[PDB]
Amino acid sequence: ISPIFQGGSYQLNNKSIDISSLLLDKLSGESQTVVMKFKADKPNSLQALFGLSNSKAGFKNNYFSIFMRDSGEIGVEIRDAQKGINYLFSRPASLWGKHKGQAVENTLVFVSDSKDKTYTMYVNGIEVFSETVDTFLPISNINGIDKATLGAVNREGKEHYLAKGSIDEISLFNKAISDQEVSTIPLSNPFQLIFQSGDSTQANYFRIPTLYTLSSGRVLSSIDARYGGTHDSKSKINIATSYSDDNGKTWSEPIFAMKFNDYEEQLVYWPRDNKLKNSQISGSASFIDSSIVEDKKSGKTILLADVMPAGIGNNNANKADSGFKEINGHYYLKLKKNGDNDFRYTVRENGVVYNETTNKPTNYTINDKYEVLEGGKSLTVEQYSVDFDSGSLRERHNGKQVPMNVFYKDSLFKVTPTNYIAMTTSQNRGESWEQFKLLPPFLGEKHNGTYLCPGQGLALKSSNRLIFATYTSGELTYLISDDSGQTWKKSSASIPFKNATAEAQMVELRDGVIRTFFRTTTGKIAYMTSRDSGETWSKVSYIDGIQQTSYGTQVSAIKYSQLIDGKEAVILSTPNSRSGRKGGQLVVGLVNKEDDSIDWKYHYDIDLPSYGYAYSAITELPNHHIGVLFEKYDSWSRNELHLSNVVQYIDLEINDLT
Ligand SMILES: O=S(=O)(O)CCNCc1cccc(O)c1
Structure with a gap:
């Protein structure tokens, strides 16, 4: 009217x-x-x-x-x-x-x-x-x-x-x-929304964006589909992907790379009042921290994310246990049958569930989907839903069966209550994703596995080498595969830090020269360097001219295909603030062919210094523009929890940055 x-x-x-x-x-x-x-x-x-x-x-x-x-x-x-x-x-x-x-x-x-x-x-x-x-x-x-x-x-x-x-x-x-x-x-x-409240994910909140320009020209994005507010695990989270075949102009209705079904894919409005805002889904399995890479040889796309069993996350993950038992050189997934006091079970080859105490194989096996079969018949548990009708969070059986999964709460067989890492592959550049597979341990049978750095893996431009950065206490644990991620080895690299969220991202300065930028606890972004295509790593240094808060934030980095001011160009995406997660920036650096030093020459403010900018993703689009998909809010602050549609995509051209 x-x-x-x-x-x-x-x-x-x-x-x-x-x-x-x-x-x-x-x-x-x-x-x-x-x-x-x-x-x-x-x-x-x-x-x-x-x-x-x-x-x-x-x-x-x-x-x-x-x-x-x-x-x-x-x-x-x-x-x-x-x-x-x-x-x-x-x-x-x-x-x-x-x-x-x-x-x-x-x-x-x-x-x-x-x-x-x-x-x-x-x-x-x-x-x-x-x-x-x-x-x-x-x-x-x-x-x-x-x-x-x-x-x-x-x-x-x-x-x-x-x-x-x-x-x-x-x-x-x-x-x-x-x-x-x-x-x-x-x-x-x-700006644009890629994922959004009410989409196919049916998740009201999104967090931890990724971006990766595939060789066909397709641009791919993964993200946390966070259902129980914007909390980390413990909660319910799925990994969702979308893509754009038109240089970031339009995007596909998203699908799931990694998903669990023990809890309903519910679209909840999560309370933002001080008395309730720390309500947390507590019986759900979940994923968190996706990272993406494309393999040149097989053509496949590879995506990894942290995996959490029911009720588990950062703070309560069983450290001092990897969740695997090593019998004669090889690693085997430990399980616990309902009613035991210990993990008297393992998962050997072809899935077979072995009782350890008697060394005998059982009638149960474990399918590709980490589901339970008895006698070759797949068991089911009942799904859970959540509501705030009673006034607090309530998690209750919704009368719907779903296949039994060893990560669920109601499973007859349960994994070790700690953090894992899984991969999936797409053969169709993000139109479908295979069933995920657990990566083996790297830091030993008696250490909780590392933490995936969310963003991109590096595919080295002159070999078949695929690298995924992860972190644990004291070190960056790089994960190297030379065979289409069929097998993995770890390259450790000490950092002067204990209990850091050392979220690391890498660029290739020239063939075999990897520089990794990462989040610290000192207020300054760090960096290290490899010159054997990831085999060994330098000591740690820090960037001046960019500021982060003490707890810091994830930083995204890319190698610009084109020369700027005649020099090799690296681009950095991060909040520039010592106070909180705001004052977003794209910072452009020219490399010194003499010593591989980077001169940070251009700072571009994404928005006002006082407007929130958090986790981010950066890609070079096939038309040489720059796509940025980011948390447009302070995802650290307890006052900005549980907002919908704050992860936003923008299109930028280099001259905008200079
Ligand atoms: O706390 S933030 O800096 O906003 C994000 C941290 N995410 C880390 C993490 C990884 C895996 C499981 C968790 O519960 C938490």
Whole structure:
């Protein structure tokens, strides 16, 4: 339908603009819609963009406002002193500031719906909150309102929450427009969603993006399909992949590389209140940290991820056990039968389940899918679902059978409660994925296996060598295969660090020369160097000019195919901040052919220094553009947990970076 008020081209330079004369008398009915197209690339700490208020002395808590923070958060206040109502809804990390040097036109649609008693906020096509209340306070029904205001809120004759920005177009509707009509509002977005709430994954949250340009020109992406908030394991997580055959313009409905079925693929809205936000799915198996590589020889695509059995993760993973028993040179998967006190079982070749205590083979075997068969008949357990209907998290049997899996809670046979690493392969460049296979241990029978570094493996351009970086305490454990990932060996490389999330990524500077950038605990990104195509590694050094917080963040790195300023070019993707995960950057480095030193020459801010930027993925697209798929939020902060559609893709060209 049609607007009751329409204005635009408003400049908010720390002075409010009065539109009361024009707007107020047009207000009528108890449901309303706001449509605001605005820019803020130098926001103040906290500012109102728009406000209906009672400006009369002693009614300072009678106003509606649409406010933002310089961290990118958006919200409304709906306060009526005389109704004893002070509503406040918001979601951190909902905005854009700048892109390619230009102010982003952000599009905001707030719906106040008096029949459903529900407020709803959209920003650039993304629903960022939807709240129902017992008691609806219409924004036009606030007692004694007498001002409509832009760039401030007029309380008691003074300008509160003064804004620095601009509102290019604002519209108003004495109606609560439908979710469908919203979608027909044109957007001016500089980003895209690859995976997204409501897609085939049916996961509401995504984390840990990957990107990898296949040789056909297909660009591939994997990611954590995180169901139980954005928590790490323990939780439910699946690995999902999508691809683009058009240089990152469009992307395929995603499929699963790695998946478990003990728990329903549920789309939950995870509570963001302090009392509940640390609810955690606790009985589910899960995957986490995918990394991708393409093998030149067989043509196959290879994808690895950390694997976690039911209830298990970083903090409670049985260290001092690999989960395997080594009998005569070879490694065998340990199991525990229901009702035992110990792992009196192993999984030998062709799956056969052996009781160790009597050395006898049993009637059970283990299929490719790590499923249990008895007598060659596959057993089933019941699926679980979760809900917050009782008010806390509740995990309950949903009356649906699924094949029994040795990683599940209800399995007759259970793996060792620690962390593993699995691979899968695609023969069709991400249109399907084979059943995953466990990698063997590398650091011994009595050590929990390492941790996969999420991102890309390196395929060495002049050999058949495939390399996947992993980390554990004290060292980067590189995983080398020269036979299409059919067999693996480890190349260890000490680092001056204990208990670091030493997430490592590699570039090939020239044939056989691998430099690996990695996350530390010192606030500075580290690096090392191999010159035998990964056989041995240098001591550790650090980068100056880039800053990270003490706990640090994953860093993505690539070898640019083209020469820049006449020199070999490396590109780095990372937050540049000592305070949190924000101030995203692409940093371009030229190599010194004399000593292999890199001169960090160009810094490109992905968005404002105060806007969240976390885990990231970078690829060189077949048209030589650069694709960036990243966590556009502070995925460390406890205040920005459980946001939907914050992993975003952008397209960049080199000249944008310089
Ligand atoms: O905590 S973050 O730095 O945001 C991400 C860490 N992910 C590490 C990890 C790997 C495997 C299992 C986990 O529970 C956790």
